[PDB]
Amino acid sequence: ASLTEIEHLVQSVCKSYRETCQLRLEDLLRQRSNIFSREEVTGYQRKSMWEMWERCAHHLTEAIQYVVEFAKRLSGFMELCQNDQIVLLKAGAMEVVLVRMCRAYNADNRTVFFEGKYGGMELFRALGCSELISSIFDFSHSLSALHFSEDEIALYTALVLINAHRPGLQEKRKVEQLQYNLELAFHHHLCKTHRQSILAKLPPKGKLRSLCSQHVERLQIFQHLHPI
């Protein structure tokens, strides 16, 4: 409850994210001028749907690994038992990756950084999931409008994992104390930087929750599955 303890928690989380961000934000915004050509896009469209589900799955798997390298660098998440740890990632791991996607999204041209270059949503037409593709560009566009900073995404994605409202938690009371200590540090950082406005413009939890459930439902059929 100490001010020093709260600030030390903000600093800790912001660094655990700076070390497991997969890509440097200084480079994601520097690559936006590198858009796919009309020929390179046609290559991604003629590809078989199995070829695309296999590529994207390697991307999501790799991304979910960083979200784990990030979760481990939290002095408080490791204090949870083997079971509670698995619960929070199994439910939250993918949701955090979906939040981190707003970084690689270009709100101007409505493109996303996919494999070295930025490309529109018609680049993934081979999947046949015309509707699912939109829910990502939509969810990412709303977050890219807020101008999410690295520390805000780090603090936000941290509150998506540590959530005492996850089913099957053994040390549920211990998760609440951790969730509060993060919710408190999240408010404190928005005051230091005068960012109280974004609190009422974030995606209502459950939307991010239901959105993720819709993608796994489609994802499982082609590639499996849980995953670790």
Ligand SMILES: C[C@H](NS(=O)(=O)c1ccc(-c2sc(C(=O)NCC(C)(C)O)nc2C(=O)N2CCC(F)CC2)c(Cl)c1Cl)C(F)(F)F
């Ligand atoms: C059924 C699908 N959903 S999905 O299977 O569950 C799925 C699969 C992969 C990713 C991730 S994570 C991630 C990352 O952080 N770093 C890696 C980079 C890209 C920087 O090289 N990249 C990606 C990615 O390649 N794509 C492909 C284009 C999409 F438009 C956005 C996501 C995610 Cl977010 C999801 Cl949702 C879908 F997309 F069809 F709906």
